[PDB]
Write an enzyme that holds these catalytic residues in place. Structure first.
Site, short mmCIF file in Angstrom:
data_model
loop_
_atom_site.label_atom_id
_atom_site.label_comp_id
_atom_site.label_asym_id
_atom_site.label_seq_id
_atom_site.Cartn_x
_atom_site.Cartn_y
_atom_site.Cartn_z
N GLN A 5 40.69 39.81 59.20
CA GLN A 5 39.90 38.66 59.05
C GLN A 5 39.19 38.62 60.63
O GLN A 5 38.03 38.60 60.89
CB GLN A 5 40.43 37.55 58.74
CG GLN A 5 39.23 36.43 58.17
CD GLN A 5 40.01 35.30 57.69
OE1 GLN A 5 39.06 34.40 57.32
NE2 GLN A 5 41.24 35.04 57.62
N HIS B 246 35.54 40.08 61.98
CA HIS B 246 34.53 39.05 62.18
C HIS B 246 33.87 38.85 63.67
O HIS B 246 33.02 38.05 63.81
CB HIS B 246 35.12 37.54 61.98
CG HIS B 246 35.20 37.36 60.62
ND1 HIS B 246 35.58 37.92 59.55
CD2 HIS B 246 34.97 36.08 59.63
CE1 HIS B 246 35.36 37.60 58.41
NE2 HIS B 246 34.83 36.43 58.40
N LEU C 284 32.26 46.61 52.01
CA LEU C 284 33.77 47.42 51.74
C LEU C 284 35.02 46.75 52.42
O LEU C 284 35.92 46.56 52.03
CB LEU C 284 33.74 48.77 52.41
CG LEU C 284 34.82 49.75 52.50
CD1 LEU C 284 34.49 50.97 52.58
CD2 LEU C 284 35.78 49.23 53.68
N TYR C 285 34.54 45.98 53.56
CA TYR C 285 35.65 45.15 54.42
C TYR C 285 36.01 43.64 53.69
O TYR C 285 36.75 42.77 54.29
CB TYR C 285 35.35 45.08 55.74
CG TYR C 285 36.47 45.56 56.60
CD1 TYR C 285 35.91 46.40 57.60
CD2 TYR C 285 37.94 45.20 56.54
CE1 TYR C 285 36.91 47.01 58.41
CE2 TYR C 285 38.76 45.85 57.34
CZ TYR C 285 38.23 46.60 58.25
OH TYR C 285 39.17 47.28 59.09
N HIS D 92 39.43 40.11 50.35
CA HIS D 92 39.97 38.87 49.97
C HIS D 92 41.25 38.88 49.32
O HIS D 92 41.97 37.64 49.28
CB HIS D 92 39.01 37.92 49.46
CG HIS D 92 37.74 37.74 50.45
ND1 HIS D 92 36.72 38.64 50.77
CD2 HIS D 92 37.45 36.71 51.24
CE1 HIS D 92 36.11 38.50 51.56
NE2 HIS D 92 36.32 36.96 52.06
N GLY E 254 35.68 54.10 53.81
CA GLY E 254 36.01 53.32 55.02
C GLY E 254 36.45 53.97 56.29
O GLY E 254 36.03 53.42 57.44
N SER F 290 35.17 53.14 59.98
CA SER F 290 36.18 52.53 60.96
C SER F 290 36.24 53.38 62.26
O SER F 290 36.51 52.76 63.22
CB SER F 290 37.52 52.32 60.17
OG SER F 290 38.57 51.92 61.11
C1 HEM Z 1 41.47 32.53 52.17
C2 HEM Z 1 41.17 32.97 53.41
C3 HEM Z 1 39.59 33.31 53.38
C4 HEM Z 1 38.49 32.49 53.30
C5 HEM Z 1 38.45 30.87 52.86
C6 HEM Z 1 37.43 33.46 53.31
C7 HEM Z 1 35.88 32.88 53.32
C8 HEM Z 1 35.07 33.49 53.10
C9 HEM Z 1 33.53 33.07 53.16
C10 HEM Z 1 33.26 31.69 53.06
C11 HEM Z 1 32.55 34.05 53.47
C12 HEM Z 1 31.13 33.97 53.43
C13 HEM Z 1 30.81 33.81 52.08
C14 HEM Z 1 29.31 33.67 51.49
O1 HEM Z 1 28.51 33.65 52.58
O2 HEM Z 1 29.17 33.71 50.47
C15 HEM Z 1 33.42 35.20 53.82
C16 HEM Z 1 32.91 36.42 54.11
C17 HEM Z 1 33.83 37.50 54.64
N1 HEM Z 1 34.79 37.46 54.38
FE1 HEM Z 1 36.52 36.20 53.98
N2 HEM Z 1 37.56 34.57 53.84
C18 HEM Z 1 39.02 34.73 53.70
C19 HEM Z 1 39.80 35.87 53.99
C20 HEM Z 1 39.12 36.99 54.48
C21 HEM Z 1 40.13 38.26 54.83
C22 HEM Z 1 41.51 38.31 54.93
C23 HEM Z 1 39.34 39.24 54.94
C24 HEM Z 1 39.50 40.62 55.42
C25 HEM Z 1 39.10 41.30 56.77
C26 HEM Z 1 37.76 38.66 54.93
C27 HEM Z 1 36.54 39.44 55.02
C28 HEM Z 1 35.56 38.81 54.95
C29 HEM Z 1 34.27 39.56 55.47
C30 HEM Z 1 34.15 41.11 55.63
C31 HEM Z 1 33.26 38.84 55.15
C32 HEM Z 1 31.81 39.10 55.30
C33 HEM Z 1 31.12 38.69 56.66
C34 HEM Z 1 29.69 38.60 57.03
O3 HEM Z 1 28.97 39.26 56.31
O4 HEM Z 1 29.34 37.82 57.89
N3 HEM Z 1 37.77 37.39 54.50
N4 HEM Z 1 34.80 34.87 53.78
C1 LIG Z 2 39.92 51.78 55.13
C2 LIG Z 2 39.76 51.84 56.67
C3 LIG Z 2 38.91 50.69 57.21
C4 LIG Z 2 41.03 52.12 57.57
C5 LIG Z 2 41.55 53.30 57.67
C6 LIG Z 2 42.39 53.99 56.91
C7 LIG Z 2 43.03 55.18 57.06
C8 LIG Z 2 42.46 56.06 57.95
C9 LIG Z 2 42.91 57.68 58.20
C10 LIG Z 2 43.23 57.99 59.64
C11 LIG Z 2 42.18 58.66 57.55
O1 LIG Z 2 41.10 58.99 58.20
O2 LIG Z 2 42.34 59.00 56.44
C12 LIG Z 2 41.42 55.60 58.72
C13 LIG Z 2 41.01 54.26 58.64
#
Ligand code: HEM
Ligand SMILES: CC(C)Cc1ccc([C@H](C)C(=O)O)cc1
Ligand code: HEM
Ligand SMILES: CCCCCCCCO[C@@H]1O[C@H](CO)[C@@H](O)[C@H](O)[C@H]1O
Ligand SMILES: CCCCCCCCO[C@@H]1O[C@H](CO)[C@@H](O)[C@H](O)[C@H]1O
Ligand SMILES: CCCCCCCCO[C@@H]1O[C@H](CO)[C@@H](O)[C@H](O)[C@H]1O
Ligand SMILES: CC(=O)N[C@@H]1[C@@H](O)[C@H](O)[C@@H](CO)O[C@H]1O
Ligand SMILES: CC(=O)N[C@@H]1[C@@H](O)[C@H](O)[C@@H](CO)O[C@H]1O
Ligand SMILES: CC(=O)N[C@@H]1[C@@H](O)[C@H](O)[C@@H](CO)O[C@H]1O
Ligand SMILES: CC(=O)N[C@@H]1[C@@H](O)[C@H](O)[C@@H](CO)O[C@H]1O
Ligand SMILES: CC(=O)N[C@@H]1[C@@H](O)[C@H](O)[C@@H](CO)O[C@H]1O
Ligand SMILES: CC(=O)N[C@@H]1[C@@H](O)[C@H](O)[C@@H](CO)O[C@H]1O
Ligand SMILES: CC(=O)N[C@@H]1[C@@H](O)[C@H](O)[C@@H](CO)O[C@H]1O
Ligand SMILES: CC(=O)N[C@@H]1[C@@H](O)[C@H](O)[C@@H](CO)O[C@H]1O
Ligand SMILES: CC(=O)N[C@@H]1[C@@H](O)[C@H](O)[C@@H](CO)O[C@H]1O
Ligand SMILES: CC(=O)N[C@@H]1[C@@H](O)[C@H](O)[C@@H](CO)O[C@H]1O
Ligand SMILES: CC(C)Cc1ccc([C@H](C)C(=O)O)cc1
Lengths: 551, 551
Positions: free
Chosen positions: B171, B175, B352-353, B356, B494, B498
């Site tokens: 996260q 971000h 994709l990322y 949650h 992904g 990545s």
């Molecule tokens: C319970 C913990 C978490 C909360 C409360 C949370 C909350 C949120 C919220 C409120 C949004 C924006 C939602 C919207 O605009 O509708 C968001 C976006 C996002 N979250 Fe989470 N999140 C959590 C955990 C995670 C985790 C573990 C990841 C994995 C890397 C993650 C990845 C993302 C991504 C990629 C976005 C979109 C970013 C963007 O476009 O700016 N979140 N999250």
């Molecule tokens: C899902 C992505 C964000 C993470 C990820 C997972 C595995 C690999 C390996 C080296 C591959 O190319 O298969 C790269 C990146």
């Protein structure tokens, strides 16, 4: 005393301060090792000794036409162009390296596009002398240096036959990527884009572009005068143009580059390219009746970028080089090579491109001979004569020789003076250091720099040491090749910047270089067969004598 | 009916509208020819037939530890890592291609960094159905789809042992390059930089960075609490932070990414990295007593970027992959290849990322179990427990399985709902189209997608056709590999994004990857030997259990 002031690291080695008074050179990948990166690896040694001098290669390229004619019709042409492209290009850092604020790699230098980059780090501020450790405590007076060695006394035409049609193309073209910011100061540019993005036609920012666009048929706004097409007025396209205070908006032409209203030659090209853009839009719509205004506009822009790169390499550079080798624009030549499709304008490249000696004593248009005072802020000449007439006139008048000294008209000598002053503010390293940075041996004396003795003696008396000679002055005072427009340094230092800028463009990458990018085979061929003559004549009522070379 | 709605062009061929109702495919360099780029060249056919399925390669990589251990100790390790890097990367356009406004290459799409890019063009607005020509006139209700197939009922832990230490790292890390702009709308980002620039630590703009920096010893501002080092308050570092109205500045920490005050896990990493930056500054000054604040700061930043890339590849990706092949971060592996050192975050990569499902039902810290309401905007937990305690706790708690479906906690299910809605606004092509765009065969039914019968039948009843299944839903509902954290698509789609993001960074290029860039051998080794354990323990009083894997 800062050890890096001695420029100890050779062959692109990097000088880094260590401890209170030591220094180290990072020779990584330079082909050399040792405290100063001077001990060569076997392969490095073979290459350096088996390579002919810039002077000898130049000879081969401007001799034996019969032989070159044979070569230009075979694959050897390609092999050589590729050779030229890669060897010149590898000399330019990419990703970019330093900027006016950082004499070292940094994330800020890499992401911050408002900075011009620089090939050699600045002369450390804490050095014994302004140039490092050589020369006097005070540099020669910029004004004096200019009057003594750069001022024109007798007009010296370019022996290569270069004309004003070329001169203005150069001024027009370069000004799309050389836009020093008065507000931010030296070392900064408003030409984000850093290359051939055609910002001087479409504008360096969205808002301006939107104000210049018709938003109908992907076309650029325009106006009819005497049944001819010309850029619109600022009244119709409210965009900031730098005109003398007092000139009404309805009398100003809006074009993309704020400075183009200050010369008929500049606006001339503005008109030509504007007509070519709208023309291309027509061809495109014929092909894609379902396309909207945006796609028609975006696609036409990519096409003109292509035409620009095409004409610049195959005619512009060809003219300057005087090479019997037929230069060629073909992105594919690099598809099998390691090349980064990005570019960053360097402050040195900006300095180097100040080709004011090209401007004449007056401007002849048919029987009429106009002066600087009559030409400079002229808002009616372009429309009075029309495109054809001016193209014909500029194509016939010879431009002045760039190198050799004493050939800048007094009307603009002030530019050179300021270029020299800016150089010191930018703290550019000495000319000799750049000679080395670009693969040449440093000059051992002023007499070797100039092929003479009079100026050399005076220069030596002023600078005190050849190792103190500054970048720009060195470029314009170096002795010129036989019957060339300038010396070898101008080419050996300029070719890398130029070619890296042309091919480093994204439309030249495998991802972009496809027919679909340009709207299809029709659009792709417009790029591939672009020509100066066609750029003009396919947009004018009649076809005049058009060339970068005098008749 | 717009013919391109049928997605006729295969293998990355480009669909272009011609005439009133025709279409053409530009098969340039796709390895195929024909109206739809379906007729393979000899080598193309050989590669596609001699290549094992994603499922078989995955098998080879997760079996025979003994064999792999042998390989990992040989040059075969570099050989395979280079293969992985190049094959995965070639799947990402570079220079970038389209954006939310242009379903075609344009100069605007290339230069305008406020846009996320996109791998596949949008579903033409004038298509028969929302997804093209398949499915119903109206897509399944986002809310309903989420409750039915994404909502967590019973917590399903990740069979690969991934913990919350990993979950928060993800996260935190992502971000820095996923920062969708509320003002501009979906398709736009504030994370100019588009990559690992560590903007989440130093700020996404200069002004913010400046407010965060101490401007002394190149360090970052900070404060002491219980004798421990933490990020400063908004009072000492007046920077915009998104905290709920009602909380005082004196209790708001300033860190770089405006959103990090909304989770102790996020601020935890903010603290760790801030401590590592200041620590690196110390090491640097010891080496270069003559350096100023700027160089110390710039150099340390480059170092942390390196440490970040190193850890993400060798530990982060390693943990996710589950591979017995020992992944490796070595820029040199690409020095002999054709690779562009640039990157542009894609909207699909953002979708994709959204992992949650990783979040648990509650957060256990020792004997205490904290609920979401006690965890979400807690401004004291981090300081109450300190870094070591939290790291230990998160390293011990298992994170939830990403793929499989029905595993997102109700507290944040709303994110998924909005992801699905944004997808339709972005008009993302169907999941199957992406399967193809990434080298896999499209699913022929929902039953093939999910390795079961119940959900599949209900999904089919809702979507009507497998070719209508949307991007995000497809990713989370696809059947997972044996004991994996997610399905093949998540990796096959992904990995390319990545790795291109990681190696495409300019510090991995030949020009930057040198000891001098990082202040010398000491700085260079910090990057080369970076480790999660060291990132934490070299900055904490005591060393707790630290890993991306549960004990
Ligand atoms: C319970 C913990 C978490 C909360 C409360 C949370 C909350 C949120 C919220 C409120 C949004 C924006 C939602 C919207 O605009 O509708 C968001 C976006 C996002 N979250 Fe989470 N999140 C959590 C955990 C995670 C985790 C573990 C990841 C994995 C890397 C993650 C990845 C993302 C991504 C990629 C976005 C979109 C970013 C963007 O476009 O700016 N979140 N999250
Ligand atoms: C899902 C992505 C964000 C993470 C990820 C997972 C595995 C690999 C390996 C080296 C591959 O190319 O298969 C790269 C990146
Ligand atoms: C008589 C015609 C010309 C006039 C009146 C003219 C005038 C000027 C002026 C006033 C400046 C800015 C000077 C300053 O800030 O001190 C300038 C800059 C420059 N000129 Fe010219 N010029 C002319 C022709 C040319 C030509 C033919 C070229 C060759 C391409 C050229 C190249 C440049 C360059 C590269 C710059 C610097 C651009 C920048 O940093 O923004 N000029 N010129
Ligand atoms: C086969 C080996 C051939 C070696 C010949 C290389 C000649 C250059 O030799 C180098 O010249 C430098 C000064 O220019 C010195 O500082 C170096 O110590 C010296 O090795
Ligand atoms: C027979 C002619 C072959 C020309 C191809 C060589 C390409 C020129 O290449 C250039 O040569 C210069 C020396 O003149 C060097 O200083 C430059 O660094 C190099 O890029
Ligand atoms: C012995 C195992 C060697 C694995 C190294 C191969 C690198 C993986 O490469 C990837 O394989 C996928 C299919 O599995 C393809 O869909 C991807 O496009 C390709 O980049
Ligand atoms: C780093 C340093 O101070 N080394 C010096 C060098 O600068 C000087 O030129 C030389 C005398 O020729 O003696 C040694
Ligand atoms: C063997 C060698 O090249 N060492 C040189 C030394 O002689 C010189 O004094 C110093 C400064 O230029 O740089 C180093
Ligand atoms: C030359 C320039 O533009 N530098 C500015 C500086 O003047 C300003 O104080 C700072 C804060 O925004 O940002 C930078
Ligand atoms: C700096 C820049 O040009 N970014 C532009 C932005 O101004 C514009 O509002 C947006 C929508 O087209 O696209 C992007
Ligand atoms: C102010 C100025 O010098 N503008 C000149 C004008 O005097 C001249 O008569 C005309 C051609 O006839 O071209 C323009
Ligand atoms: C471009 C076009 O309209 N071609 C159509 C195709 O779309 C359709 O799927 C097929 C029937 O199977 O007949 C043909
Ligand atoms: C031989 C071939 O592949 N031609 C196909 C055609 O059959 C199909 O109807 C159309 C739309 O998908 O695309 C093309
Ligand atoms: C989404 C966005 O920012 N687009 C803006 C638009 O709203 C504005 O009217 C135009 C003029 O500057 O520039 C662009
Ligand atoms: C967009 C951006 O970050 N550009 C910055 C500018 O704000 C700053 O004033 C200048 C001086 O450091 O450097 C550059
Ligand atoms: C508002 C909130 O829930 N914050 C909690 C607090 O209640 C709890 O007692 C503390 C650990 O003792 O961690 C924090
Ligand atoms: C001086 C520079 C701006 C123009 C220029 C002149 C000659 C060449 C040839 C192909 C070369 O590499 O020698 C390239 C560019």
């Amino acid at each position: 005393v800062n050890p890096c002031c001695y420029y100890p690291c050779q062959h692109q080695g990097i000088c880094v301060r260590f401890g209170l008074d030591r220094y180290q050179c990072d020779c990584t990948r330079t082909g050399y090792s040792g405290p100063n990166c001077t001990i060569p690896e076997i392969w490095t040694w073979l290459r350096t000794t088996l390579r002919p001098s810039p002077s000898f290669i130049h000879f081969l390229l401007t001799h034996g036409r019969w032989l070159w004619d044979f070569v230009n019709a075979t694959f050897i042409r390609d092999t050589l162009m590729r050779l030229v492209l890669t060897v010149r290009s590898n000399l330019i850092p990419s990703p970019p390296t330093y900027n006016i604020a950082h004499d070292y790699i940094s994330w800020e230098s890499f992401s911050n596009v408002s900075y011009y980059t620089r090939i050699l780090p600045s002369v450390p501020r804490d050095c014994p002398t302004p140039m490092g450790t050589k020369g006097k405590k005070q540099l020669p007076d910029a004004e004096f240096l200019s009057r003594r060695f750069l001022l024109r006394r007798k007009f010296i035409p370019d022996p290569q036959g270069t004309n004003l049609m070329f001169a203005f193309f150069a001024q027009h073209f370069t000004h799309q990527f050389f836009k020093t910011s008065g507000k931010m100061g030296p070392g900064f540019t408003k030409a984000l884009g850093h290359g051939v993005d055609l910002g001087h036609i479409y504008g360096d920012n969205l808002e301006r572009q939107y104000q210049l666009r018709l938003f109908k048929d992907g076309k650029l706004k325009y106006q009819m005068l005497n049944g001819e097409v010309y850029p619109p007025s600022v009244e119709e396209a409210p965009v900031l143009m730098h005109y003398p205070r007092g000139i009404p908006p309805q009398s100003q032409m809006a074009v993309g580059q704020e400075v183009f209203g200050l010369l008929p030659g500049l606006m001339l090209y503005a008109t030509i390219w504007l007509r070519e853009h709208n023309r291309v839009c027509d061809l495109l719509k014929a092909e894609h009746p379902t396309w909207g205004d945006e796609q028609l506009f975006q696609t036409a822009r990519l096409i003109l970028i292509g035409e620009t790169i095409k004409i610049v390499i195959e005619e512009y550079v060809q003219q300057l080089s005087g090479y019997f080798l037929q230069l060629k624009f073909d992105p594919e030549l690099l598809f099998g090579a390691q090349f980064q499709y990005r570019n960053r304008i360097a402050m040195e490249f900006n300095q180097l491109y100040h080709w004011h000696p090209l401007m004449p004593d007056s401007f002849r248009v048919g029987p009429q001979d106009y002066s600087y005072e009559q030409f400079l802020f002229n808002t009616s000449m372009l429309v009075d004569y029309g495109v054809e007439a001016l193209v014909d006139a500029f194509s016939r008048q010879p431009a002045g020789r760039i190198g050799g000294g004493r050939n800048i008209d007094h009307h603009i000598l002030h530019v050179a003076v300021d270029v020299i002053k800016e150089s010191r503010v930018l703290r550019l390293q000495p000319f000799n250091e750049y000679r080395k940075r670009f693969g040449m041996k440093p000059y051992t004396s002023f007499q070797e720099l100039t092929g003479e003795k009079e100026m050399a003696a005076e220069l030596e008396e002023l600078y005190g040491d050849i190792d103190a000679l500054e970048f720009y002055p060195g470029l314009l005072l170096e002795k010129c090749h036989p019957n060339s427009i300038f010396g070898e340094s101008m080419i050996e230092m300029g070719a890398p910047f130029s070619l890296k800028g042309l091919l480093g463009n994204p439309i030249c990458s495998p991802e972009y270089w496809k027919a679909s990018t340009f709207g299809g085979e029709v659009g792709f061929n417009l790029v591939k067969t672009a020509t100066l003559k066609k750029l003009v004549c396919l947009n004018t009522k009649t076809c005049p004598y058009v060339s970068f070379h005098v008749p």
